[PDB]
Design a protein around this ligand. Sequence first.
Ligand SMILES: [Ca+2]
Lengths: 297, 298
Amino acid sequence: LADLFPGFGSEWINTSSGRIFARVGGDGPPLLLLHGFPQTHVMWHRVAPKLAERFKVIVADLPGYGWSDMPESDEQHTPYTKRAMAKQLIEAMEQLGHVHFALAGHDRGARVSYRLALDSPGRLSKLAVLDILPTYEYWQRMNRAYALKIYHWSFLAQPAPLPENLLGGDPDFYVKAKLASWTRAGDLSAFDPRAVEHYRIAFADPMRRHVMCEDYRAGAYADFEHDKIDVEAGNKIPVPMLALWGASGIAQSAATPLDVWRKWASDVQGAPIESGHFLPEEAPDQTAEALVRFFSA
Amino acid sequence: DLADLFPGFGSEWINTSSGRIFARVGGDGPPLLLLHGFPQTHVMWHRVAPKLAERFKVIVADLPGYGWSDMPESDEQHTPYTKRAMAKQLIEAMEQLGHVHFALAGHDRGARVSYRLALDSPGRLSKLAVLDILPTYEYWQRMNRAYALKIYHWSFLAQPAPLPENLLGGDPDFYVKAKLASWTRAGDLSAFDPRAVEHYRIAFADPMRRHVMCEDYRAGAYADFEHDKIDVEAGNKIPVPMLALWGASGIAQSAATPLDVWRKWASDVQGAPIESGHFLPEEAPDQTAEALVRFFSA
Ligand SMILES: [Ca+2]
């Protein structure tokens, strides 16, 4: 497996919920980058060096993903709720001495990120979320067209071992299908093949796949419930935040992303990037430039 | 190796322009077509068909592309697996038997064929029974978080090929048993005759059969929905007397009445809950049989 972050250190950060793996590079204010599904930290390999010129970039595998330890789940999928994940990452950052840091997340990592910002906003200087709406918003907009487009939200949330048994027949196909289907081009051409290798190898582990389903089960239940409480209480993210989304991406599929985030965040700017879901790999220059400018503010 | 679950029923291969329909045929009297759904075959009727055969010529057919019926080759619009096309094929199949006016009971996908038949060609039907469904349009209009999780397979199997095909191939035995078990009231396979499960398992083991089922669900997400939508917007109602049976723990029920929903679609509909999960004729065979005999006799 290729090192896609030449010059970046490698940290195994111990937490009470297991070790967080992270590539660490650059200097300056701490910036935590969180990948999503079905990826690992290496999806930032095209934008992290650019950020590393101005920030201490911490590129972490989510709890349960990539090389991070996999906390044993439970009946409520607790360790893979975004609330628990955010707690674990806060702990991880504290092990490095970062108690106040900037955060950019994509996909599942973006969900950890806004949940972190709701639960523990004092930990965040600024927050960027890439190609998501809040989990609550996806579910609330889950009509026919949206159920078809993000079917995996209900499929991977099915009780164990139903998704796991089906994914186990041909894990390579599924990880490649999900990568391809959500690019602007609809194929794997936006990805570095050595990165695809990282994604493929992570997905080949049956426990890693279970964890991804657990993440999606949390996404269907506890994560939804946590968000529901916040939106129905009018709890807004007080951290300055950037919402970036792909013009051909998931977030814009069933809502105007900046409109939705303005319901969730008191101080949100948004920009579309010509790209599918995988902004940091499909449109690395445009994404890194948006992130550098936002976080330099 | 595959048990004959319809003692006294013959077997017909009925020729249609789109391929052969397989059916078990038993009884005498008015013709009654029974249509299974997913992921079953005609054998799901094995506990109630003998009851109905006391009073009716019971024709227990595998849907087009299901079971032992031929699989017409699909196209870009999944046309042969739309309920409209399936209904046209079964209308032709019944015509081959001299049945141009018949009673009809369908469960699951077969109930979808059945009410679409009733909408398109109401004069073909004396009476209609639908087991544990709402119209396809209604499922999609009610698509929310809760329903998306419950009938996830409606969007999963409608994914463009070969995504569900490939995943279904990962563990087809588990999948069909899981679908059967998870929609019963018990949550296991104890409601089913093990010889019936063997039929469902063996049908599900053929990748071509699984592909057809996905085509059926692709139709269910697209053409089928659009056909239903037109009838909704035109105010077209099913005019044949209709019986809607649903499991108290089935798919059709939720918070609002299945019967209140069917009244929007049919002008003459009666409805009863059955203590049952989704698979009324196997989970509650005599309560289902009694409801069907009482209704179809009139
Ligand atoms: Ca297996």
